[PDB]
Amino acid sequence: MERAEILGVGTELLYGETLDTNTAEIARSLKPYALKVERTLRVADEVAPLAREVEEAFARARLVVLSGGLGPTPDDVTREAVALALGEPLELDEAVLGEIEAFFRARGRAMPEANRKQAMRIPSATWLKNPRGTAPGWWVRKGGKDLVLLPGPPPEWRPMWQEVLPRLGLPRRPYAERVLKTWGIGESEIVERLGPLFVREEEVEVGTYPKVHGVEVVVRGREDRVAELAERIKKKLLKEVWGEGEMTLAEAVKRRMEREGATLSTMESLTGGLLGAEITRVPGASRFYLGGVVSYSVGAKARFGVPQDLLSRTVSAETARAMAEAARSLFGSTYALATTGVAGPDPLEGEPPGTVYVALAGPTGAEVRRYRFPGDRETVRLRSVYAALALLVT
Amino acid sequence: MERAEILGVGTELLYGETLDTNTAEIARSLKPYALKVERTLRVADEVAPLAREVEEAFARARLVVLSGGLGPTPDDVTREAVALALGEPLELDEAVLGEIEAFFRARGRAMPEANRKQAMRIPSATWLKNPRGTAPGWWVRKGGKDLVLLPGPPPEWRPMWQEVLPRLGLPRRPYAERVLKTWGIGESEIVEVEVGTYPKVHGVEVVVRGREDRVAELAERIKKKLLKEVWGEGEMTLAEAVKRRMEREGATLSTMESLTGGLLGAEITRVPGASRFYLGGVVSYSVGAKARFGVPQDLLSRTVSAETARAMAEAARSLFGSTYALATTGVAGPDPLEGEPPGTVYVALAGPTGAEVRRYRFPGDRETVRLRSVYAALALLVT
Numbered sequence: 001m002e003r004a005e006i007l008g009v010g011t012e013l014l015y016g017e018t019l020d021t022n023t024a025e026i027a028r029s030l031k032p033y034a035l036k037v038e039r040t041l042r043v044a045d046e047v048a049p050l051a052r053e054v055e056e057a058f059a060r061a062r063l064v065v066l067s068g069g070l071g072p073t074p075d076d077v078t079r080e081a082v083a084l085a086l087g088e089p090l091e092l093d094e095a096v097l098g099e100i101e102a103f104f105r106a107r108g109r110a111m112p113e114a115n116r117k118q119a120m121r122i123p124s125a126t127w128l129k130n131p132r133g134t135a136p137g138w139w140v141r142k143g144g145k146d147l148v149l150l151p152g153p154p155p156e157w158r159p160m161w162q163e164v165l166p167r168l169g170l171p172r173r174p175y176a177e178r179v180l181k182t183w184g185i186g187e188s189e190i191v192e193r194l195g196p197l198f199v200r201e202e203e204v205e206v207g208t209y210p211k212v213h214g215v216e217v218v219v220r221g222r223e224d225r226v227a228e229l230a231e232r233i234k235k236k237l238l239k240e241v242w243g244e245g246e247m248t249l250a251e252a253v254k255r256r257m258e259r260e261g262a263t264l265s266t267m268e269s270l271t272g273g274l275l276g277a278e279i280t281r282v283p284g285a286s287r288f289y290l291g292g293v294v295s296y297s298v299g300a301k302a303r304f305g306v307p308q309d310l311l312s313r314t315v316s317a318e319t320a321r322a323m324a325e326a327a328r329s330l331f332g333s334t335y336a337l338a339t340t341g342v343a344g345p346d347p348l349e350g351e352p353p354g355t356v357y358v359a360l361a362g363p364t365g366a367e368v369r370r371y372r373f374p375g376d377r378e379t380v381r382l383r384s385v386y387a388a389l390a391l392l393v394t
Numbered sequence: 395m396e397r398a399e400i401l402g403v404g405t406e407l408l409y410g411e412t413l414d415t416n417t418a419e420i421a422r423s424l425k426p427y428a429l430k431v432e433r434t435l436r437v438a439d440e441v442a443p444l445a446r447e448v449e450e451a452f453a454r455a456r457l458v459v460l461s462g463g464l465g466p467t468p469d470d471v472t473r474e475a476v477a478l479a480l481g482e483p484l485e486l487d488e489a490v491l492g493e494i495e496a497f498f499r500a501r502g503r504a505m506p507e508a509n510r511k512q513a514m515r516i517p518s519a520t521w522l523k524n525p526r527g528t529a530p531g532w533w534v535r536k537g538g539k540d541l542v543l544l545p546g547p548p549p550e551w552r553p554m555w556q557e558v559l560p561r562l563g564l565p566r567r568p569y570a571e572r573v574l575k576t577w578g579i580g581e582s583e584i585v586e587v588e589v590g591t592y593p594k595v596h597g598v599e600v601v602v603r604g605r606e607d608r609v610a611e612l613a614e615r616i617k618k619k620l621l622k623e624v625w626g627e628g629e630m631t632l633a634e635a636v637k638r639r640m641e642r643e644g645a646t647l648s649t650m651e652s653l654t655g656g657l658l659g660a661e662i663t664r665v666p667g668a669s670r671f672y673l674g675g676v677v678s679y680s681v682g683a684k685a686r687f688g689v690p691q692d693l694l695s696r697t698v699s700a701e702t703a704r705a706m707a708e709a710a711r712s713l714f715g716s717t718y719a720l721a722t723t724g725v726a727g728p729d730p731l732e733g734e735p736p737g738t739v740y741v742a743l744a745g746p747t748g749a750e751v752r753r754y755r756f757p758g759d760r761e762t763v764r765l766r767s768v769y770a771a772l773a774l775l776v777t
C-alpha cells in the first residue's frame with residue numbers, strides 16, 4: 001500500500017499561532033482510499049527547508065498534498081519550493097494573471113504587484129480554480145504521482161479539494177472504523193482481555209486511547225475485517241463499553257434518564273461543580289437534571305445533610321453514600337450522584353491525592369465506588385466527574 | 395543555528411481525533427533558545443516508520459523531543475522505535491520495575507504483565523521521573539546531542555519538560571513574552587519586538603514578544619495605556635485574582651448558578667487553596683431548586699432578568715453566610731428563552747453593601763456562552 005504525504009506550510013502552524021486542522025482534515029478525507037498516511041508535517045515558510053521536505057515526500061509517496069503559503073508575500077514561498085523540489089521552472093500564466101487582476105478590480109482596486117507571483121505554475125501543473133480567493137491551486141501529475149497545492153484558508157481549499165480528489169485516480173478501499181468507549185478498565189487489562197484480537201496489520205488495526213472519560217478502543221481499516229474484529233472486541237469488553245461513535249457519558253446519562261422518565265441531582269465536594277457542568281453541557285439537560293449543591297466547606301457539607309459523625313472522614317465510602325442519599329432527599333430526584341475525595345496537590349484526612357469516592361443513590365438503594373486516580377489536581381477532578389457519570393451507564 | 399526536531403506520536407494525532415497541541419507547545423517553549431525549528435511531525439504508531447523518522451530527526455538536529463506512545467499496549471511503540479533508530483537494545487531496569495509495582499500496589503492492584511515494558515530503556519538513556527503515571531520518560535545524551543522522550547498527556551510531560559529543559563545545555567537567546575489580560579474592551583479600541591491582541595473567553599490578551607529588553611520596556615508602556623482594563627498578567631487567571639482578593643480581605647465566597655450549570659463553582663475551585671474562602675454553591679437548574687434555596691416565587695417565571703440575578707446572589711449569600719456571593723442566569727443556547735436570544739446573560743455580586751448586576755450579550759455557541767458567563771461573574775470581583 002503506497003503513501004500519502006500531507007504538508008501544512010506556515011511558520012505560525014509550528015507554534016500553534018494558527019491551529020493546524022488542515023493536515024488532519026485532509027488526512028481524514030483520504031480514508032476511503034488505499035493509501036497509508038504514516039506522518040503529517042508542518043513546515044516553516046522557508047524555501048530551502050520546504051523544498052527539501054517536498055522532494056523527500058514526493059520521492060516516497062503516491063500522493064503529496066500541501067496546504068498554505070500560496071499568498072503574495074515574501075513569506076509565501078510554497079510554489080517556489082515545489083518548483084525547486086521537482087526541478088521545474090515557474091512560468092507566468094498571463095490568462096491567470098488576468099483573473100487575478102479581475103479579482104482586485106471587482107473590488108475597486110488595482111492589482112498589487114506582489115500578487116503577480118500567484119500566476120506562476122510549473123509545466124507539470126494544471127490549475128485548480130479558486131473563485132473564493134486570489135490564489136489558484138495546482139495539480140501536478142508526474143512519474144505516475146500526484147502533488148496538489150491548496151490555499152490555507154479552509155473555505156478556499158475545501159471546495160477545491162473536494163473537486164480534484166476524485167479526479168486523481170487514487171486506488172479505493174472500502175473503509176470502516178468503529179469506536180468503542182469504555183469505563184473502568186485500564187490499558188493493560190484491555191491488552192490481556194484482547195490478546196490476539198489486538199491486531200496491528202496492514203488490512204486492519206486496533207488502537208487504544210486513554211481519556212479522562214476512559215479508554216477508547218478504535219478498530220479501523222477494511223470494512224469486512226473491521227466489522228467482525230470490532231464485534232469480537234465488543235464481546236470481550238461488553239460490560240465496560242458504555243457507548244460508541246459520538247456518544248458522550250453526559251449524553252448516555254441523558255438517554256437513561258429520558259428512557260426511565262427519571263430525574264437527577266448532585267452533591268459535589270472535590271469536583272466543585274464540574275459534575276453539574278458536565279451534565280448540563282448537553283442541550284435538553286433541564287428535562288431531567290433538577291440541580292445540585294457544591295458542598296465545599298465543612299459547614300456546607302453539614303448544611304446539606306452530611307451526618308456530623310462523618311465530617312472527620314469526608315473522604316470515605318460512608319460519606320459518599322450519605323452525600324448521595326442527602327442530595328436525593330434534598331432535591332426529591334429519582335437519582336443523585338455524589339463526589340468526594342482528594343484532588344491534590346496536598347493530602348486530606350491523611351489520604352493521598354487521587355483518592356476518590358463516587359456514589360449513586362436511587363429508588364432501590366445506593367452504591368459507591370472507590371478510585372485511586374493518578375494525575376494532577378485538574379486530572380483527578382475530571383476523572384471523578386466521569387467516574388460519577390459512569391455509575392449510571394456502568 | 396542548530397535544529398530542534400519535534401515529533402508527536404499517535405495515529406489519533408494524524409487524523410486530529412485528538413488535536414496536536416504538544417508539538418506547538420514544546421516549540422514555543424524553545425523560543426528562548428538558539429535552535430531553529432524548521433518543521434514538526436505527527437507520526438503514526440508504527441515502529442518501522444517511527445524509527446525511520448527518529449533516526450532522520452536525530453541525524454539533523456542538536457535536539458529531538460518526542461511526545462507519546464509510552465503506554466503498555468501494542469500501539470505504544472516509541473521506546474522500541476527509538477531503540478531501533480539509535481542502534482541500542484532495550485533493557486529492563488529492575489529499580490523502575492519495583493516502582494511501577496509499588497505504584498499499582500498502593501492503588502490496591504497487582505502489576506499487570508504489560509506494564510513491565512514501561513521500565514525498559516536503552517543504555518544511553520537516563521530516566522525522567524513521572525510522579526504522574528507509570529511511564530517515566532527518557533533523556534539520551536549521545537554524540538553531544540539530546541533526545542527526550544515524553545509521555546503524551548500534557549498534565550504529565552509538562553513538569554518533566556519544565557525540569558529537564560535547563561539541564562540540556564542549549565545555547566540561550568534573549569527572548570521573552572509578556573501577556574496582558576484585559577476585560578471589557580474589544581481589539582479595535584485597544585489598537586487605539588511585536589504586539590498582538592488575542593480575543594479569549596476571559597477577555598482580550600495583549601501579547602508583547604521578541605527581544606527581552608524591548609519586550610519589558612514596551613509592555614510597561616502598554617500596561618500604562620490600558621491600566622484600568624488589565625486585570626492580570628502571565629499565569630494569572632480571574633479565579634486566582636478572586637482568590638487573592640478573598641485572602642487579602644479574609645473574606646468568603648459562595649455562588650448560585652443556572653445556565654452555567656456548576657462551571658462557575660468549577661472555575662473558582664480549580665485553583666489550589668480554594669477551600670480557604672469558597673464555602674460552596676447551588677446549581678439551581680429547575681424552578682423547584684430555585685424556590686427551595688431562596689429565590690422569591692414572584693421571580694420564578696422570569697429567569698432572564700437583572701432581578702433574578704440579584705435575587706440569586708442574595709439567596710446564595712444568605713444560604714451560605716458568605717461575605718460575597720456571585721450568580722449567573724440567562725440564555726446559553728441553542729434555544730431562545732423568554733423571547734431572549736442565546737447569549738443574553740445577567741451576572742450578579744451580592745456583598746456587604748448590596749448587590750450589583752451586569753447584563754451581557756455574548757456571541758458564541760452554548761459552551762462558549764457558558765464560559766464567558768463564568769468569567770463575567772468572576773470579573774465583578776476583580777475588575
Ligand SMILES: Nc1ncnc2c1ncn2[C@@H]1O[C@H](COP(=O)(O)O)[C@@H](O)[C@H]1O
Pocket residue numbers: 008009010013018019020021022023067068069070071151152153154
Ligand atoms: N494548516 C492550517 N490549518 C487550518 N487553518 C489554516 C492552515 N493554514 C492556514 N490556515 C488559515 O488560513 C489563513 C492563512 O491565510 P493565507 O496567508 O492566505 O494562507 C490563516 O490565517 C488561517 O485562517
Ligand code: NA
Pocket residue numbers: 317318321
Ligand atoms: Na454507611
